[PDB]
């Protein structure tokens, strides 16, 4: 059905009324989202049907219709923008400077912004407009605030 490039909401009807489980990015005919949002289940765009193509629980990413297409990376210096699409509220650009997640396998960017779980999958952007990752997989720190990683998949 609809295959226009942009940001989309991921909704469900199995619960009361209509509920937003997450968000995603359509780009180059491919719908990119976080795995925990859909659990690898097939999606419906209008009357059309999107099917999973690639997925990985550890990376917490999943792509529909084709391979992962987003490949831009945070430079470690510049401020970025979270294009947050919160449940029931309009899309909103929130600019922030990312922090760091120190892992045994290397450092990853991190955005310390607080949004409901249904915002999982919102794109993180750079000054060029390129999607440098998805927001929605992270950790809760000492003061109850939420800090997400800048999750980016690998292109082919």
């Amino acid at each position: 059905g609809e295959t226009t490039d942009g940001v989309y909401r991921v909704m469900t009807r199995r619960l009361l009324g209509s509920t937003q489980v997450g968000v995603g990015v359509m780009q180059e005919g491919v719908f990119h989202t976080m795995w925990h949002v859909t659990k690898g289940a097939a999606l419906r765009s209008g009357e059309g049907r999107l099917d999973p193509y690639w997925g990985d629980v550890k990376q917490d990413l999943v792509s529909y219709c084709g391979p992962w297409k987003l490949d831009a990376a945070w430079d470690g210096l510049s401020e970025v923008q979270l294009l947050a699409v919160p449940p029931g509220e309009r899309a909103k650009n929130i600019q922030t400077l990312p922090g760091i997640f120190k892992t045994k396998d290397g450092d990853i960017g991190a955005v310390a912004l607080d949004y409901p779980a249904g915002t999982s999958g919102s794109p993180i952007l750079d000054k060029c407009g390129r999607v440098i990752g998805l927001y929605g997989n992270g950790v809760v720190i000492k003061n109850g605030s939420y800090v997400s990683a800048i999750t980016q998949g690998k292109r082919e």
């Binding site: 942009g6 989309y8 550890k58 991190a110």
Partner: protein, 39 residues
């Protein structure tokens, strides 16, 4: 059954809400894709 609805265009908005801190957290990524703090 899940479905998608368009929410906007992917573009940088000049002069938008500038908020949020930038912390250096020590974390661990498990096989189930879950993050956890390390101290």
């Amino acid at each position: 059954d899940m479905y998608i609805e368009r929410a906007g265009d992917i573009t940088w908005e000049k002069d938008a809400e500038v908020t949020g801190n930038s912390p250096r957290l020590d974390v661990a990524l498990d096989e189930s894709g879950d993050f956890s703090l390390v101290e």
